[PDB]
Amino acid sequence: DIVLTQSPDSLAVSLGERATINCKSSQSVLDSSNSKNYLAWYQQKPGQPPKLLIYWASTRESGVPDRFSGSGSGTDFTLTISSLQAEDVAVYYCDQYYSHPYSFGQGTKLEI
Amino acid sequence: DIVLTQSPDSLAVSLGERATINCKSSQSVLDSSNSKNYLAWYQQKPGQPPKLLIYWASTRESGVPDRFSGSGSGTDFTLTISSLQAEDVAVYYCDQYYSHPYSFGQGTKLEIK
């Protein structure tokens, strides 16, 4: 089964700075036939459900601020917040839907 | 945008009994072209990430105990937990991946009575 490991577990950045979160998959999630990486990124705040930010590893979801971006391929992915804003404080997760059982990373806490 | 609303928001159930959680979608998530409901259920405990329980509305993910079952179609879905166990205490979510933006329900907190 595919396991996702995020780094770091907690990240603290100043207001307006760039935030980078990594996710490494034990196996590649890149479909060689369609060139798509079945990897998604989610944001979750206390008392609320997870919210999809990025899918196909680098495609931004509707409604998500443009400062959020995803990159990477195969087994190494990165979520980037170009300029951090107070409202970005939350827990971030990567999730693979390439092969069952689908699985989430352990989560990364982002604070100011 | 399709919005999912769960009911109840929280519930207390006795060990060994059946727990039922409902999810209503503002618009149908059933694709008439292939007969599939793009609806999934997740379980989440404090300090841990969400864990997929059911997808396609009724297909149980591998590794998940048979006491978890999903049913429903179109705009109404149900997650049933039979023979409740102490470790089933968590927040449960439904999630639709039919149309963008994909979306989760608000969550239902299940506790032991």
| Residue A41 forms contact with B (CB below 8 Å) | no
Report, at the CATH architecture level, how domain B1-113 is classified. Sandwich (2.60)
Of B51, B93, B101, which is closest to A49 when you measure between CB atoms?
Answer: B93
Q: Distance (Å, rounded) from C-alpha B64 to C-alpha B42?
A: 11
Rounded to a whole number, what is the distance in Å from the CA of B50 to chain A's nearest CA?
7
Asked if residue B18 lies in contact with residue B55, where contact means CB atoms within 8 angstroms, the answer is no
Length of chain B: 113
How far is CA B101 from each of CA A83, B74, B93, rounded to the nearest angstrom?
Answer: 23, 18, 16
Residue to substitute from B104, B106, B108, interface A, most A β-carbons within 10 A: B104
Q: Which sequence spans correspond to the domains of chain A?
A: 1-112
- The reported resolution of this PDB entry, expressed in Å, is 1.6
Tell which CATH architecture fits domain A1-112.
Sandwich (2.60)
- Residue B51 touches chain A, beta carbons under 8 Å: yes
Distance in angstroms (rounded) separating the CA atoms of residues B102 and A87:
21
In angstroms, what CA-CA distances link A2 with A15, A74, B65? Answer: 35, 12, 19
- Check if A98 contacts B (Cβ < 8 Å): no
How is residue B98 written in tokens? 């039919």
Q: What gap in Å lies between CA B1 and CA B89, rounded to an integer?
A: 31
Method: X-ray
SS3 A76: strand
CB A100 within 8 A of CB A64: no
> CB contact, 8 Å: A100 with chain B?
yes
Residue B70 near residue B60, CB atoms below 8 Å: yes
Residues B65-89: b if buried by 16+ CB within 10 A, e if exposed: eeebbbebeebebbbebeebeeebb
- Of residues A48, A55, A107, nearest to B49 (C-beta): A107
Show the beta-strand stretches assigned E in A1-112: 4-7, 10-12, 19-25, 30-31, 36-37, 39-44, 51-55, 59-60, 68-73, 76-81, 90-96, 103-104, 108-111
Chain B hits for A106, Cβ within 8 Å: 48-49
Calpha distance A111→A108 (Å, rounded): 10
- Gap between the Cα atoms of A36 and A15, Å rounded: 33
Asked, as a colleague might, if the bond just before A49 is cis with ω within 30 of 0, I would say no
Collect all residues of chain B within an 8 Å Cβ-Cβ radius of residue A50: 50, 93, 104
Determine the residue among A52, A94, A108 to mutate to test chain B binding: the one whose Cβ has the most chain B Cβ atoms within 10 Å: A52
A102 contacts B49? CB cut-off 8 A:
no
Interface residue A71 vs chain B (CB under 8 A):
no
Note the Cα A16 to chain centre separation in Å. 19
How far apart are alpha carbons A90 and A108 in whole angstroms?
8
